Design a protein around this nucleic acid. Structure first.
Ligand SMILES: [Ca+2]
Ligand code: NA
Length: 276
DNA sequence: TCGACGGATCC
DNA sequence: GCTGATGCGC
DNA sequence: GGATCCGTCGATCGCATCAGC
């Protein structure tokens, strides 16, 4: 059945108003999506920090609109080493960070342009586009390697500041995170492996699935639909885009939103509200 | 994802 | 620029 | 032996690149 995201709760569990509005979007071609009036949708949602994945854009092919984006002056970008047009993530924010880094500190995993780290006063923000195990599970073995190393990079970070991790994590965590769980229990993003890696990341770092913390039993809540087979219209999809945060931050959690209506990609955008 | 495909097996 | 083709994504 | 069950297994869509001239 269809899904309707409830209104934005902009109040913390202790009655404080939200201060920070992070918005993440797997854009699936930075150039297509801009052409598709995506940056329009950004201008109206008005985030403080905007994280994007699947940029598929070279450092010199980025449209000019982006730099001119108001309210998001500090703009950091990572694209892969030698695979032109693959992968790519960005992070834009109204305020300027204290330190920004790229990658997770592992040569094997920092070559496809997938991780940006943005340290602020009161927390650290990590945005990432995770490797898909692949059609035919061709890269599932490597995705076990990435999950393990990403796990311990975040455990590290977490020990020093409150962490917020967002973006496309390329796994549906539980049968409630996708419309066709039985049809997909051995395809990319729903294998016993990928799902055990998500749960291990949650127990080890540790982190909470922000959206599920609030709506732990609401189904058909998705962030991705295959372009094929007019699937978005039928609401057959996968929740692949998360905000994961340290338990420390749960008193600051006001709301975790899924922007189902916003068009421009095969992912829809997601939006986090914090009282900081 | 979706159907067309099997091949199993059920009355 | 314009045509073919192939790669990668759930 | 007819009609169901239930596991494969190609191909829709879209956004990129690359070869060639
Ligand atoms: Ca391929
Ligand atoms: Na009978």
């Amino acid at each position: 059945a269809l899904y309707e995201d409830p209104p934005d709760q902009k109040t913390s569990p202790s009655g404080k108003p939200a201060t920070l509005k992070i918005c993440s979007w797997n854009v699936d071609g930075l150039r297509a999506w801009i052409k598709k009036k995506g940056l329009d949708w950004v201008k109206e949602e008005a985030p403080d920090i905007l994280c994007l994945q699947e940029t598929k854009c070279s450092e010199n092919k980025r449209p000019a609109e982006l730099q001119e984006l108001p309210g998001l002056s500090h703009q950091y970008w990572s694209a892969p080493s030698d695979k032109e047009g693959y992968s790519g993530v960005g992070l834009l924010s109204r305020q300027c960070p204290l330190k920004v880094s790229y990658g997770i500190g592992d040569e094997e995993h920092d070559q496809e342009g997938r991780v940006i780290v943005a340290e602020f006063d009161s927390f650290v923000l990590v945005t990432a586009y995770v490797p898909n195990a692949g059609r035919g599970l061709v890269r599932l073995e490597y995705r076990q390697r990435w999950d393990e190393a990403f796990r311990k990079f975040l455990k590290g970070l977490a020990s020093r500041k409150p962490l917020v991790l967002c973006g496309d994590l390329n796994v549906a965590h539980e049968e409630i995170d996708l419309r066709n769980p039985k049809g997909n229990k051995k395809n990319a993003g729903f294998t016993p492996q990928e799902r055990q890696g998500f749960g291990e990341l949650l127990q080890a770092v540790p982190l909470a699935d922000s959206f599920r913390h609030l709506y732990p039993n609401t189904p058909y809540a998705y962030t991705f639909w295959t372009y094929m087979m007019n699937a978005r219209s039928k609401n057959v999809g996968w929740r692949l885009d998360y905000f994961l945060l340290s338990h420390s931050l749960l008193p600051a959690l006001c709301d975790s939103k899924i922007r189902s209506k916003a068009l421009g990609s095969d992912h829809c955008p997601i939006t986090l509200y914090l009282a900081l």
